[PDB]
Amino acid sequence: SYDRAITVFSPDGHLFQVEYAQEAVKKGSTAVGVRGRDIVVLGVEKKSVAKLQDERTVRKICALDDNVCMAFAGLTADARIVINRARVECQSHRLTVEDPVTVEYITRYIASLKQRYTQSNGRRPFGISALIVGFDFDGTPRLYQTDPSGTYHAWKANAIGRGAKSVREFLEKNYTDEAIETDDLTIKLVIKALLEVVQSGGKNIELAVMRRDQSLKILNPEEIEKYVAEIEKEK
Amino acid sequence: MFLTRSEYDRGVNTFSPEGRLFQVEYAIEAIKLGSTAIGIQTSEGVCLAVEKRITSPLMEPSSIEKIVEIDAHIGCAMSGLIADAKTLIDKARVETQNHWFTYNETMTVESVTQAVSNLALQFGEEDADPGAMSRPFGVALLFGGVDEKGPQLFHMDPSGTFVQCDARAIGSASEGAQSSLQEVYHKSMTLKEAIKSSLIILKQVMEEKLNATNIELATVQPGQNFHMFTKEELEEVIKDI
Amino acid sequence: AGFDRHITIFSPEGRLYQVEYAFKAINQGGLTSVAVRGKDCAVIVTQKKVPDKLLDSSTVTHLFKITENIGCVMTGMTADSRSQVQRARYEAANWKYKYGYEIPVDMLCKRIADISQVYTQNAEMRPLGCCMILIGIDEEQGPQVYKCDPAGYYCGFKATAAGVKQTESTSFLEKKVKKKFDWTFEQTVETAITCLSTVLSIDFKPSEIEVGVVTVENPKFRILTEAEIDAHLVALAER
Amino acid sequence: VRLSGEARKQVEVFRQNLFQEAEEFLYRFLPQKIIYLNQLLQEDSLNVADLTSLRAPLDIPIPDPPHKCGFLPGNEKVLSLLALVKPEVWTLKEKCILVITWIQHLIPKIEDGNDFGVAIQEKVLERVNAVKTKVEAFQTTISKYFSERGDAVAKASKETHVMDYRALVHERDEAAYGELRAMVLDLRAFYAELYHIISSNLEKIVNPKGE
Amino acid sequence: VRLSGEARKQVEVFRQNLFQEAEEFLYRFLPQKIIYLNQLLQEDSLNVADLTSLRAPLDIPIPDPPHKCGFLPGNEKVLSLLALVKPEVWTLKEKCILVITWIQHLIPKIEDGNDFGVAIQEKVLERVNAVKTKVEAFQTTISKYFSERGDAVAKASKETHVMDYRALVHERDEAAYGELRAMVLDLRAFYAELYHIISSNLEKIVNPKGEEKPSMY
Amino acid sequence: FRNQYDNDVTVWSPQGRIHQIEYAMEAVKQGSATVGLKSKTHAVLVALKRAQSELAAHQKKILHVDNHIGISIAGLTADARLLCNFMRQECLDSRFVFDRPLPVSRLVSLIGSKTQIPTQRYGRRPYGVGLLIAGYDDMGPHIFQTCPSANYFDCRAMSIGARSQSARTYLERHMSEFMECNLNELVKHGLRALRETLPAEQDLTTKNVSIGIVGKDLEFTIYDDDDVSPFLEGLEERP
Amino acid sequence: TGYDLSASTFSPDGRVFQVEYAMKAVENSSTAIGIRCKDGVVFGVEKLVLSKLYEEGSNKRLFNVDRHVGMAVAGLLADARSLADIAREEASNFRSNFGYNIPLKHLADRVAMYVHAYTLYSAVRPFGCSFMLGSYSVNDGAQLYMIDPSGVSYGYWGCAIGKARQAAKTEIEKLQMKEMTCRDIVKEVAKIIYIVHDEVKDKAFELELSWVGELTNGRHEIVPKDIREEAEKYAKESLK
Amino acid sequence: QPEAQAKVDVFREDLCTKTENLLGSYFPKKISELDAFLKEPALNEANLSNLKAPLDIPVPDPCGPVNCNEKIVVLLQRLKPEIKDVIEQLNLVTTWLQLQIPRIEDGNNFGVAVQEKVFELMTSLHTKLEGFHTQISKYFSERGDAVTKAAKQPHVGDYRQLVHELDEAEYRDIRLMVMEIRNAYAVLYDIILKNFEKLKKPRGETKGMIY
Amino acid sequence: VQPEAQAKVDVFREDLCTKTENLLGSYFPKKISELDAFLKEPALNEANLSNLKAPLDIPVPDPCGPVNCNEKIVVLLQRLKPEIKDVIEQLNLVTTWLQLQIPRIEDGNNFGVAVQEKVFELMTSLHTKLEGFHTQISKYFSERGDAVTKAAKQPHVGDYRQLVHELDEAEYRDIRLMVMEIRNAYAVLYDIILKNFEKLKKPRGETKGMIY
């Protein structure tokens, strides 16, 4: 009745197509983000190799710029478009104001794009939610989340995608100032959280870190194996 | 005996029988989904308050911005869709600065509210511009600022209609919160009394117990600019209650 | 069904029923027009029916002059007919402007018909519910007769009819061409009038019909007066 | 399907006879029936003013307060009215069948569009079927009169103490007279409605898909 | 049509009588009936708690393991409650008939536009017709009670050996009392529902097409 | 059923009525009432304002277009604001170009054209607002009404909005005296007329009344809550 | 049946029913008639007075589309005013380009084509107005034209539009307009309008008349009130 | 052959004259007459103990003639001509409306829809009135059966009560039936009068000069 | 006229509102408790129906004495009948309450009306089922009497003996399911009304207005 067009409000004022896009996000692979004191760690599950596929082509985590990166859960093609648009906006902002982009600026831009696609019929919402991580000029860690609706919110730590409810409950339990004390502890926290919802530990998680003034580093599979081994042993 | 045909509610630009234009009415129903916000106008100033409705502890409380600054003289409190709220806030800010640029003066609260209202009116699509949302803006705003006429509180709705109001409540518990406003309010009350009464009403309507985290509070007084009560000031007042 | 009610959509048998309905719109008018070619002349006849006495008989006409040496008769909606007539006049004048010589009858028919095609392919507009029959003299080919229809078919003809009695009239004309001996101008006009009168059963008077002719001697299209029409009619009755 | 010459001849003669009979019914028999039903309505027997007049004599002994039943005949008046009306009823049913099959034969090959003609044909045959079911209901009531009157008369004779059965028998006769008069009226109305519908929509019925 | 003055006067008399009677019904009769019906419900006759008390002695001579029956009376309690309720059923039927005639006289000349008031009118007509059908079902049940208890008592007396026919007689009486209390409270509900729908929708029902508007023509 | 023919303005009904335009004309009835009446030397607009709540201020029902023209609205405030902007820009354009006040009749003609364009095209809805336009020009005092249908009228007096028939009948029975009235007498007559529309419990107040006056010597002025007290005090009571 | 919903559609039997539905619009209108005689053309309209409140000389259905031509309308007044604006624009453009007053036949053809544009497209409805146009020029003579909502245009010696078209047409038919002169034709137009007016259904009417002819030196103008009063008194007398 | 159309047109003109006479004179007269009858004291009885009729069956410690309820049969005897009349008039107006239905077309189907609305009301009325016809016979048969049951089983008193209850139910139903017949005449007159223009001339000529 | 008449109907409406509120608060929960308790009792739930079999004292072929009804079934039916009457009465009460809460017809914003329509459909279905139970009791008595009479008239036919036994067993399991259904009807009615109470109470909602 009222779920076929984005423009039409429902009785009780629910816009339902954007809700359906938010539901589409839930289908996607899990992603998790956590703010350490000097690190921001972004972890994403890997669906499966399929044994005849090249892993390099598929990468959920991406770097918008030197100081900002994102991970997504939702439609992969839409994510690719949004990533490219945010990258060109990053370089354009540097061009315009001779300064590097702030994490809140880029998440605002991505949210504005998603909002622009929601408002008008003849265009469908981007079926993605994103986890944007970066370090600002002051050096404070920043974690933001975006959704198809176009609202953005800072999170100390969060998850998106399938099993987001379970892993975020686990993270609400586990997260504390103590865990954020160590960079290795932050990485281990996100690894344990993804382990809460994933078939196998090392094979099916792709993880990355950003340090205070370093570029994004996708942790090697051997490093992830070492960290899960340390996590597994402690239990 | 039930007649539920409606068959005219769908699609703006359709006058239903009795000429009611139900899409706009549904948009006005939409703000009741939003968090309750409350405004009281007094001689000493105008105060604005809202319940943040934090979903989870991990979410940063500061990020929720349901009270914002259009300019030093005017602030806004919003309930309804955060996104189209951001759009209207941007329109308000740019119009205030355009007025400063052109006339070297500060807009009145009524003029700013009219400026955003004109944008809200554009859902009708009388203009040929592509970049205007076909749906009405699913948000209600409370514009509070000190102008040449003193403290003023204006209400704005999805229709784009706007009115001055001595005290108003928007959002989910606007029904009942407005009755509490009507009984408590008297024109002579100072801003301290207004702050206390508004926080009482917000405590009544809010499901969760009131705490410094889950409310946002602000005031603009004639001498001061738009000010947000900090964690400590919020702690002091919510303790005083 | 729903396969009708939009021109664009094809039926499961691929027929585009809407244009076929536009063909019925021609017969809805209740008038008939006949065109027959001759060795040195081409003629167009059509019924002239005045519903009210108050109507000025001069104004009502289905015979129009696209250019000095081309004439047409329109059958169908009066308004669509007038619009297509205006478009034809514009096309003829624009042809003269661009190419320096009078438009051929075949090319005029082709232009109007392909316009009708753009109508029957684009969604929002509807095919004009009218049929055109053009008569003119071409120096190379002699007399010519052509017909546009709402679909975009523009074939030339020795003789034709359009309207409600089209099948009866073409049956009549088919017999006459089959017993082909010739057609001079008088016999051409007589054949046209006899076809129309026989199929309708009208036994016309001069007011009831309007005739237009082209001849190699006088190439300009002319609409004959009531006196000339009565002269032809009396000759028919006498023999 | 391979068509034999004799088979083609048989189908052709059936179609020819059906169409001829349809024209004959519509233009010759139907107005004749309308005038016949008019005069039958004008007859005095069918416009009896006082229904108590046709109250039949039911001779069954009143029981003495605290012997045998003779032959009880049926009401000659309603029996005569039945003798008049029943042929007309069955005749209309037959002609309805003729019109139905005539229309069905005029229905063309199924095609995607230009279906307004077949829609008109379907509407007309729907009305004709409605007329037929009403006529069959008249036949059912005509059959019911005899059985109901027999049940009532038998019940009154078996139980002479109860007078309401005798009153019921008289009521059955009165209701039968009213129903039979209504049958004649609505038979005329059905004939006229069939003529009106078919004559008004004849062009589309005979030629639904345009030319 | 050519109308005589006597014809116009007769039609006007019927119209004014219908309209004033509808006003009187809705504004005087219906609230009076509501108070009367709730007083009936509050009365103890309709408020019996133990329905085995309602059982009436069925004097049939039980057969001896191996005389003509007396006059067997009906259950006086049930019969009295029937005496109370049946005129209420018939009156509600009558007032529903009046209401349908009132609304049917109020519907305007048929027109393509301004159809929402006519929709409200016909919807209200449909609902009151449903109430009419329900009360017709009630009176059907009232007749069914007498016929069923009579044949049950006759079968019990004829087959004295089977006790369950006697149990059926008592069961029919008990079910009758329950159904009749349900009937009277339903009657109160129907009256209140009629008032609610008509009062809430009265402006459209009375004046469907609405006030005259400035001509577009 | 006939739910069809009501969906859009571009669909005619089988009896020649565009139902969406009528549904728009219903919109004026929703709004609070307004009354306008004129004398030989003055034109008056008076309104009944409504408030969402006790704390809220009453809405603005009278708007000034120019010194010589002002309006009062019944129906959608959005459409009212848009049309008022259009009218203000038209008057400003006239003053800039010709250095004369725009004729009020010409202004309502422009309003009629602008309002008519939505009704015929698919897309934008009809302007579901009814305006009373009152102004003084060289010809004299004038009052016009505009419907959501683009048709407009010239009136001795008029009332639009909810329960306005009572005001109209009061105005009609008292109309003869209006022409020679003083401005005080005229505003008092209009105030009584709108008092007819109010509920019996409600009464005129300083708050809910707004008065708009324009004349030969008086530019359009809206007398607000405090300023209506001189005009209101004269009125006696409810009958 | 979804064929009648839009004007782009055709009925299966070859009928565009939206246009006919729009033709039914004008029949809602009060009648208007125009009669052509030797000297010129006279127009008349039965303007029903809906309310006493409405000013006289308002809701005018007689428009001047150029100095030498006048227009009388029946159907939707909004569409009619818009069509009058279109006709005025066409006349002004003709004067600006071709340097002289537009011929009435050409003006009727252009406005008729503008009207006919709307019957084709689905986005936009047909006009809801039928209007008459009349002019007098010493070269062309007296000319009266009527345009239906379809865009059909024809020249009428006498014409009627609106609710009472048929009765008005028979009354006009028994007139012999060709010989007559305008100052009599105004009286007979008043007679016909008073005849066709229905007192029971329509409460009251104010006769609105205009003419164009040699007596105006070829300018359409509203009748002088003395002549209006004379014609109205004659019409009331003849009505009996 | 146009003779058939001539005959059917004569019949239609006769029906038009009849229905105009009906709406003008007969329906108002019957409305007034039925209003007077329901206002009569006869079917307005305050106490139904007067309506109660004797049962001659002896109580146990062959029955005499058990006469029908004189009051109810009297009221029914005057009722049933009214029901017959209203049914006949309803049938007449129904056939008149049926003969006014125009040729089927895919547009201008207003007035036709008006006719359908009037038709559904007339159909409802016809069903109700023939229900009244059935109900009278049901009363007679049911009272006779109840009396027979009581006589066969005098010990049962519920059959006595059943007979009396059938009697009072019939009296009240007669009152409601008279109200129904009056209201039927009235609403039929109102609907036909209000919509007579469209009912007589549903479509009209909309062709004009489009084509 | 008659604002007093509106007042009287409003008094009836307020009485229905407070009654249904108290009913939902207390009566429906305790009735659910009572009915599940009745289900748990051994009388309603029996291992073998051979225990349920009641003596039929007809003599077999090589006039009968009083053949009594199945006392177990009769006692359980006497327990059941008040529950049927109670649930039907409460269902009628809440149905009337919802009917009174129906708003004025409006062309749009009828979603609140739609909620009331769905809840009303559920209530109507429950009413039909409960009336069916009340009829089924009388059906049981009539059928058992008919079978006993047939057995007595034709003692040679044993299938009538098996018929009386089968009718008794069928009625026992039927009343078991009936008590289950009364409990479930109370529960589901409570759940529907409690979940949808806001819309049922206030279908249209506050007329925010201010568009005009």
Swiss-Prot record, chain B:
GO CC term, one of those recorded: extracellular region
Superkingdom: Eukaryota
Main location: cytoplasm
Phosphoserine found at: 16, 56, 63
Keyword Ubl conjugation annotated: no
PTM annotation (Phosphothreonine): residues: 55
One Pfam family linked to the record: Proteasome
CDD domains: proteasome_alpha_type_5
Tissues expressing the protein: Expressed in fetal brain (at protein level).
Induction behaviour: Up-regulated in colon cancer cell lines. Up-regulated in fetal Down syndrome (DS) brain (at protein level). May be the target of the transcriptional activator NFE2L2.
InterPro entries: Ntn_hydrolases_N, Proteasome_alpha, Proteasome_alpha-type, Proteasome_alpha_type_5, Proteasome_asu_N, Proteasome_sua/b
Keyword set includes Acetylation: yes
Membrane-spanning intervals of the chain: none
Glycosylation site residues: 198
Assembly mode: The 26S proteasome consists of a 20S proteasome core and two 19S regulatory subunits. The 20S proteasome core is a barrel-shaped complex made of 28 subunits that are arranged in four stacked rings. The two outer rings are each formed by seven alpha subunits, and the two inner rings are formed by seven beta subunits. The proteolytic activity is exerted by three beta-subunits PSMB5, PSMB6 and PSMB7. PSMA5 interacts directly with the PSMG1-PSMG2 heterodimer which promotes 20S proteasome assembly.
Protein name per its UniProtKB record: Proteasome subunit alpha type-5
Species in which this protein is naturally found: Homo sapiens (Human)
Gene assigned in the entry: PSMA5
Swiss-Prot record, chain D:
Protein name: Proteasome activator complex subunit 2
Xref: InterPro entries: PA28_C, PA28_C_sf, PA28_N_sf, Proteasome_activ_PA28, Proteasome_activ_PA28_N, Proteasome_activ_sf
A molecular-function term among this protein's GO annotations: endopeptidase activator activity
Induction: By IFNG/IFN-gamma.
Annotated Pfam families: PA28_C (PF02252), PA28_N (PF02251)
Family annotation (PANTHER family): PROTEASOME ACTIVATOR COMPLEX SUBUNIT 2, PROTEASOME REGULATOR PA28
Transmembrane regions listed in the UniProt entry: none
Family that this chain belongs to: Belongs to the PA28 family.
Top-level division of the source organism's lineage: Eukaryota
Known partners and oligomeric status: Heterodimer of PSME1 and PSME2, which forms a hexameric ring.
Residues annotated with Phosphoserine modification: 4
GO cellular component, one term: nucleoplasm
Function: Implicated in immunoproteasome assembly and required for efficient antigen processing. The PA28 activator complex enhances the generation of class I binding peptides by altering the cleavage pattern of the proteasome.
A GO BP entry: regulation of proteasomal protein catabolic process
Keyword set, alphabetical order: Acetylation, Phosphoprotein, Proteasome
From Swiss-Prot, chain G:
UniProt xrefs under CDD domains: proteasome_alpha_type_3 (cd03751)
UniProt keyword annotations, A-Z: Acetylation, Cytoplasm, Host-virus interaction, Nucleus, Phosphoprotein, Proteasome
Subcellular location field: Cytoplasm; Nucleus
Complex formation: The 26S proteasome consists of a 20S proteasome core and two 19S regulatory subunits. The 20S proteasome core is a barrel-shaped complex made of 28 subunits that are arranged in four stacked rings. The two outer rings are each formed by seven alpha subunits, and the two inner rings are formed by seven beta subunits. The proteolytic activity is exerted by three beta-subunits PSMB5, PSMB6 and PSMB7. Interacts with AURKB. Interacts with CDKN1A. Interacts with MDM2 and RB1. Interacts with the C-terminus of TBXA2R isoform 2. Interacts with DNAJB2.
Entry annotated with the keyword Cell membrane: no
Main localization of the protein described in the UniProt heading: cytoplasm
Membrane-crossing residue ranges in chain numbering: none
Phosphoserine: residues bearing it: 238
This protein's encoding gene: PSMA3
A single GO BP: proteasome-mediated ubiquitin-dependent protein catabolic process
Entry's Gene Ontology molecular function annotations: ubiquitin protein ligase binding
GO cellular component terms attached to this protein's record: cytoplasm; cytosol; extracellular exosome; nucleoplasm; nucleus; proteasome complex; proteasome core complex; proteasome core complex, alpha-subunit complex
Protein name per its UniProtKB record: Proteasome subunit alpha type-3
Induction of synthesis: Down-regulated by antioxidants BO-653 and probucol. Up-regulated by bacterial lipopolysaccharides (LPS) and TNF.
UniProtKB/Swiss-Prot annotation, chain H:
Source species, domain of life: Eukaryota
One GO molecular-function entry: endopeptidase activator activity
Gene Ontology BP terms: antigen processing and presentation of exogenous antigen; regulation of G1/S transition of mitotic cell cycle; regulation of proteasomal protein catabolic process
GO cellular component: cytoplasm; cytosol; extracellular exosome; nucleoplasm; proteasome activator complex; proteasome complex
Induction note: By IFNG/IFN-gamma.
InterPro entries the UniProt entry points to: PA28_C (IPR003186), PA28_C_sf (IPR036997), PA28_N_sf (IPR036996), Proteasome_activ_PA28 (IPR009077), Proteasome_activ_PA28_N (IPR003185), Proteasome_activ_sf (IPR036252)
Keywords recorded for this protein, A-Z: Proteasome
Quaternary structure note: Heterodimer of PSME1 and PSME2, which forms a hexameric ring. PSME1 can form homoheptamers.
Job of this protein: Implicated in immunoproteasome assembly and required for efficient antigen processing. The PA28 activator complex enhances the generation of class I binding peptides by altering the cleavage pattern of the proteasome.
Annotated family: Belongs to the PA28 family.
Name of the molecule in the record: Proteasome activator complex subunit 1
